Amino acid sequence: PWHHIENLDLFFSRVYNLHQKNGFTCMLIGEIFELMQFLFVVAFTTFLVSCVDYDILFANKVTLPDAFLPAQVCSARIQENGSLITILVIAGVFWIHRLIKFIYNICCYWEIHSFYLHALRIPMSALPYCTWQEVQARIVQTQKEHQIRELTELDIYHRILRFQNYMVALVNKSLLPLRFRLPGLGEAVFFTRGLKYNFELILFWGPGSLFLNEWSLKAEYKRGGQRLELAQRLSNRILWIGIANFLLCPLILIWQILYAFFSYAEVLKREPGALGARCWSLYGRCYLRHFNELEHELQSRLNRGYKPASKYMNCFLSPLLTLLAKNGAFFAGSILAVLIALTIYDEDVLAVEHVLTTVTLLGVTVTVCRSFIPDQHMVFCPEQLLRVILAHIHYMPDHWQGNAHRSQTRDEFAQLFQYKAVFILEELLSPIVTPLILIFCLRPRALEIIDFFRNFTVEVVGVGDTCSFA
Amino acid sequence: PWHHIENLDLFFSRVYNLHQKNGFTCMLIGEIFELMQFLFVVAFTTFLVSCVDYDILFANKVTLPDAFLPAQVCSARIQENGSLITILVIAGVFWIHRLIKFIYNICCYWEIHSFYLHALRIPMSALPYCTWQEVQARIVQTQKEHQIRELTELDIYHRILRFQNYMVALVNKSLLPLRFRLPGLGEAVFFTRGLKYNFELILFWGPGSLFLNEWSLKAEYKRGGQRLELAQRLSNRILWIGIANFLLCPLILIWQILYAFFSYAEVLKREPGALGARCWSLYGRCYLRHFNELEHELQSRLNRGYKPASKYMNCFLSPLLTLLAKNGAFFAGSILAVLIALTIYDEDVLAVEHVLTTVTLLGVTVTVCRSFIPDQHMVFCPEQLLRVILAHIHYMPDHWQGNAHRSQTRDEFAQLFQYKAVFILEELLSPIVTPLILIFCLRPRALEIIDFFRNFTVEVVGVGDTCSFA
Amino acid sequence: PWHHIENLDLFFSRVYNLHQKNGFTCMLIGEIFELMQFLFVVAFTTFLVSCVDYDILFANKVTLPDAFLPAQVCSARIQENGSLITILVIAGVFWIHRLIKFIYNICCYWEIHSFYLHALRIPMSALPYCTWQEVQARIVQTQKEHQIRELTELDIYHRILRFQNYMVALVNKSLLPLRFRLPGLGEAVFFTRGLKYNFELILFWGPGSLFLNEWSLKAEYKRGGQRLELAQRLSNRILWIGIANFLLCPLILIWQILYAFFSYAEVLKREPGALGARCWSLYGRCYLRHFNELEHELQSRLNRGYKPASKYMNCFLSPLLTLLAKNGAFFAGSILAVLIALTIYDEDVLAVEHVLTTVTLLGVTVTVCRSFIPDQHMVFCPEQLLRVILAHIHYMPDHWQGNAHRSQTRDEFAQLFQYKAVFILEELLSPIVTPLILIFCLRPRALEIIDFFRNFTVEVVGVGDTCSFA
């Protein structure tokens, strides 16, 4: 590929994304699936609402296609529902918008698919078996062939990760709200995934934002006098985008409930210790992140620190919770063992009214409670394995060096390394909470955001306008 | 709490028990559960015996409350059963005796709940997150405030554990029987949990025992001439308590069978490798115990030595047992795989007569046999990982230093680290065996018990009459 | 046992086999089982074909013995099937041949059962708890008692393993074919278990082979002139044995399909991650084998190298396979979670037509796909844990010292450490492929086989004719 390309940020970000998606054809059949996964969840849940007759399926030998309605009625009953057509049109417009954007990506990743072949000499077979240090070093020393002088291996880092080094400095300085006292829990920590998307939509995307192009910001934000007129323009902007989150609040809420039922409700019956496992929260991914550190380099420490940190949390379980788990598993296991031994004896105490759903619900009640009960012979693991976690993730809040066994070291660590089911809970609440905390919580901090981009923005001569901390 | 308390043994034992039950309100809602767990097992098994009509439940659409009898017949059919009323009265008298004793404990632990707050400055929130070295050091250096001179940190150990340092010396000297040749197994080792309770009821509880109070013993047992008249008083005493175990034998036997069915019979269907796991036996807990070593300090080595010792036993499995397990799992898995593939084909070979209980019983037959089969790729673990177990539990019988692979190192170690299902078996046999071995086996050793408390009882000036070995 | 035995190879091979089968009575009840396991698979699958009436079992309250036919019809319908009688006679002749050979082994292992008792002083109780270094040293220093002069501890190794040191040198020199390009996979590696049996039937068993007795070979194969007349005798011999594999091809094919259904088809429903586990292939067992190294000494490194090598293969999983596994588990788990939550709601959407087999087949579809999905938090294990595997298994093909992350280090290692399900696949194909590659692939290599036994056969004065490499 060719002489003096127009955008060295969107180019290098797609060179990196092609390597991490393990090739062109793997990313292509990958991103087909999420367009099909959106289309499956919307079309199958619309068929369940309108076109399955449950009176035949519940009460009234019957076959499984006897419940289903014919296609001349399947397409008819769906249309005298003005709410559901309004759901299907706005879902349909968003989907064809996501279909146009995908065809635009195939034309653009094919030009970088040919960058590996014809300029870096790396096939799509050898590409999942290269590291990034392979792919990066091909770009650096072949710059005599393609212009695209002696940049650095560092100046490719500032271009792939320019707008990620701002979210590191906005979280470490608490210029984004991220934490709220509510009565009942204490100090809760927000910053879910749909909230981080808005923070760059306030700050980095569009003509009316900062950053007129993707590599330099406005000249407005470097002049002084503290410019409350310039800080006011950001202040009403969070309104018009925050009102947009409030009007689109009911339709993102429908999507998060549908997606959680289709991807977690069967895992509840089999293995509810899966949802009792923990995962590094998005607040923790922005707290343990370094400056100019790629997305696969963050994960290489967050997989190595997963194994100690998941057993650090297991040796702090609540005495009141374990005690309710052991005696709740006794009372449910005792009526199971009566019903289990009564089914083995005669096998006709099944098909009496509620017995088969009672074994199903008591069997998952016992399965939940066995997850809450820790290991009986759990080595209580002298609680400076926190110096093993500090070797992998490199930031501890400094109160934790000798106080590793308290509750001001256990409750602050669960803000970084939350449950899986709390992560499920914060994604369903996310359409509700996000327009409230942009309007009421982010707008008072607008004068410190505008002053942040004045004082900490350093222009480096090759890359452009970077964060000062990075 | 106040000046010169009357009983420094029962006080310090409850200071320790309040810390290990993780607080007042955790122990309170804890001990409510065992009063409810006794009341659940007795009332639910009485309802199953007398008030469920199984002819409607087995043979004669039916609902699950159609089997149950109405309350005017539920309370009527229970009374023309003179055995069951006799069961319910003696269970009822024992339960209200256990209810009076619990209300007496709330009044006494509340006085020690206020000892943490108003004398040690430790709340109930900070208490599960303290160690005993926290709680002990609060008691030691605040003795200028409360009298309760410069005792030691050692003299609190002799008071919490006075009657546990005797059971260490009575087991290590074999003054308690604990081992019996029966034809068929070899030398079996008893000492279950209801037997250890009686040994302190012969020796430490009551006015007619030794130890007139809880901290000093009689003057009778220090005089000499070997006192067969004094050894006779113990000899008929084991009769009157051993006859009491024989008369109360049928009602403790009913309780152990009921409790094992309500807490282990559903674990058989799911996971019978749970009952093939091993646990440190009560003979092992008194054999590996040190002198003046608290109950949580014994468990801290018995959890660290659990992980090597459970895989030391897995690399000694019987060749005759593995061979019957592999070929028994073939013959049962082959008729499963016919019946599994015959259910997938048509799904109406269910609801023909015994097929669904056959899949249930062959499925647990295969599940039992897969537990008996060891790992195919089991590293045969060079059998001096016995020097890893010796690091955690500190006593080996000295034959085992180089002979770690024989059967006189495997069968003596399973006396310390028995199966779980053998522990189940020794609790059901425990009402049967215990009155027999007090009358016939303990009474011949009464002259050596009386001479033991003459020769090994040292009076220390702060604590009182302690064991000489401790 | 007595003076100057006639065959020191078959004696020492049975002294070793008695130790590895853990005794006389363990081997006796062991080898009864495989005669019963052959008889179970043949008789139970014959009853399923001819004597179960499925029209009563599928469509037409019924009992499970109502499907079965009476014995006067059970023995009648089996006889108007000229294919099945031909199957049962040839299975019956092979079984009574395997029954005569077993009674001949009881008479011969009893003479070596008395060799442990009356000449080595080792009972059958102490025998599973001895090592081979116990059993070998008993034979070596008691040679003053039994003649059976100062042989070596090495000269017992050449006698137990004489015909196994040839198969090491025939595989390392590629005088046996073992590898074939087919379009679609690349270079595949054969050498299944029924193929290795034939290679010693061409070379070591019979009067018409090499090795006139079990300890010395013919004088024919040491003379020179390259002897194409002598290489022709081997060339037509592989025909007459290869035609025998082709005529007996349909009846060994029936046995491998029957045995795989009776021992793996129920493991598919429970745990299909079992068949996704890997096992050291038979090509790998002959590639990592040393010279004069016993069968239990090979396994002691292949169990220690099992644990790193099974996680070396898990960190090379295909990006296209993981991506189809995650999105296939979404689409199947979403229709499960609808059907699971629809059964909990009413419990009468069971017994509508195909729902219960749909939960069964989608439940195993999700279970298969969760096996293909790797660990999310898998430490990517810096790929020179290949220096941990090289410590246990002692041969690496030398391209792998620094190239541990490519596909020419992953695909050559799966030839040594193949899947379990590929091992299942190569045993069902084994009756088909084996007569083809003896006739068409082994006969062109006959002149290099005849020249191999001329140049590499060294006569040692105690043992006889051994391989030169060993």
Ligand SMILES: CCCCCCCCCCC(CCCCCCCCCC)(CO[C@H]1O[C@@H](CO)[C@H](O[C@@H]2O[C@@H](CO)[C@H](O)[C@@H](O)[C@@H]2O)[C@@H](O)[C@@H]1O)CO[C@H]1O[C@@H](CO)[C@H](O[C@@H]2O[C@@H](CO)[C@H](O)[C@@H](O)[C@@H]2O)[C@@H](O)[C@H]1O
């Ligand atoms: C001015 C107006 C403001 C506009 C409002 C903004 C509110 C955003 C809502 C859009 C929304 C719901 C759409 C529902 C459609 C409703 C239509 C009707 C439906 C029928 C009634 C899209 O849809 C999401 O649905 C999720 C499933 O529900 C998917 O799963 C997810 O993955 C699973 C596997 O790991 C997990 O389980 C789990 O992680 C998820 O579940 C997501 O992949 C998918 O993007 C949620 O937005 C999401 O978009 C993505 C970008 O692709 C954003 O990621 C960004 O990526 C980088 C980018 O720079 C940056 O690094 C960073 O910025 C950010 O990480 C997210 O931040 C998030 O915001």
Ligand SMILES: CCCCCCCCCCC(CCCCCCCCCC)(CO[C@H]1O[C@@H](CO)[C@H](O[C@@H]2O[C@@H](CO)[C@H](O)[C@@H](O)[C@@H]2O)[C@@H](O)[C@@H]1O)CO[C@H]1O[C@@H](CO)[C@H](O[C@@H]2O[C@@H](CO)[C@H](O)[C@@H](O)[C@@H]2O)[C@@H](O)[C@H]1O
């Ligand atoms: C002169 C006359 C002699 C009197 C006879 C003495 C015979 C003793 C029998 C009383 C009995 C059966 C009562 C049945 C009631 C029948 C009424 C009718 C019922 C309806 C027909 C009580 O009941 C027990 O029932 C058990 C369940 O069945 C409970 O589970 C248990 O925990 C589970 C969780 O780990 C486990 O699974 C498993 O470990 C158990 O299962 C026990 O907690 C409970 O105490 C068994 O006695 C038991 O009492 C306890 C003390 O509380 C004793 O512990 C002591 O504690 C310290 C104390 O100093 C000392 O350290 C030490 O001494 C000792 O450790 C035991 O030794 C034992 O003896």
Ligand SMILES: CCCCCCCCCCC(CCCCCCCCCC)(CO[C@H]1O[C@@H](CO)[C@H](O[C@@H]2O[C@@H](CO)[C@H](O)[C@@H](O)[C@@H]2O)[C@@H](O)[C@@H]1O)CO[C@H]1O[C@@H](CO)[C@H](O[C@@H]2O[C@@H](CO)[C@H](O)[C@@H](O)[C@@H]2O)[C@@H](O)[C@H]1O
């Ligand atoms: C001139 C003419 C040539 C003759 C043709 C030769 C073709 C050989 C076919 C005979 C055959 C099928 C017989 C079916 C009977 C059909 C009758 C009608 C049936 C009704 C229609 C026997 O039957 C086998 O059936 C298998 C199950 O199907 C068994 O399971 C196995 O174990 C399971 C547990 O680990 C596993 O899961 C799995 O490993 C198997 O599955 C075997 O144990 C059993 O031997 C397959 O042969 C086998 O025999 C054995 C020797 O005993 C051979 O082992 C040898 O041992 C040493 C010896 O020196 C040497 O070290 C070496 O040489 C070799 O290792 C094998 O090499 C193999 O060849």
